[PDB]
Design a protein around this ligand. Structure first.
Ligand code: HEM
Length: 153
């Protein structure tokens, strides 16, 4: 459970991210595919992308990034009361996409790195601490649902 102060640190930096959702979406995903290429195999629609240039030019990847960050944003804004939002997400990711928890840890790493680079003034040690805590909360609850749904993760 995060404190009200910790949530504020999270939503404060997120308000900046929302000024350019598409741009942040691309940076985060490209960072992920470059740092952990195996994740690219989960996308039968992006597995063909070879270079960072091709990725930055993909309109579909950009739209996916927006869809992803929008869903994450709605969750964070619930400040822990994200039960309703998580169920449908856990079902598709556990039964259809089959995304293991390890991959959620990898993207969490990408989110932090991108925020740290683009928003240094609003992403200090305390702010990163809160963001990490929020993402771990997300991962903890998703992994729980996974078990309930019959997927080890
Ligand atoms: C920060 C956590 C993430 C959030 C909030 C998120 C959100 C979403 C949403 C809302 C969709 C579309 C609706 C749906 O299928 O449920 C989606 C699709 C998808 N996600 Fe996630 N996702 C996350 C992380 C990941 C990761 C780490 C992977 C893979 C390494 C992944 C792989 C996919 C795939 C394969 C699709 C289907 C895309 C397509 O084929 O059109 N997601 N995700």
């Amino acid at each position: 459970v995060l404190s009200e102060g910790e949530w504020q640190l999270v939503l404060h930096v997120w308000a900046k991210v929302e000024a350019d959702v598409a741009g942040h979406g691309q940076d985060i995903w490209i960072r992920l595919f470059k740092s952990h290429p195996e994740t690219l195999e989960k996308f039968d629609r992006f597995k063909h992308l070879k270079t960072e240039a091709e990725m930055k030019a993909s309109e579909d990847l950009k739209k996916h990034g927006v869809t992803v960050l929008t869903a994450l944003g709605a969750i964070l804004k619930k400040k822990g009361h994200h039960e309703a939002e998580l169920k449908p997400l856990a079902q598709s990711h556990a039964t259809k996409h089959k995304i293991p928890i390890k991959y959620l840890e990898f993207i969490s790493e990408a989110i932090i790195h991108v925020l740290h680079s683009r928003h240094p003034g609003n992403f200090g040690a305390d702010a990163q601490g809160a963001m990490n805590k929020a993402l771990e909360l997300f991962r903890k609850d998703i992994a729980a649902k996974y078990k309930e749904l019959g997927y080890q993760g």
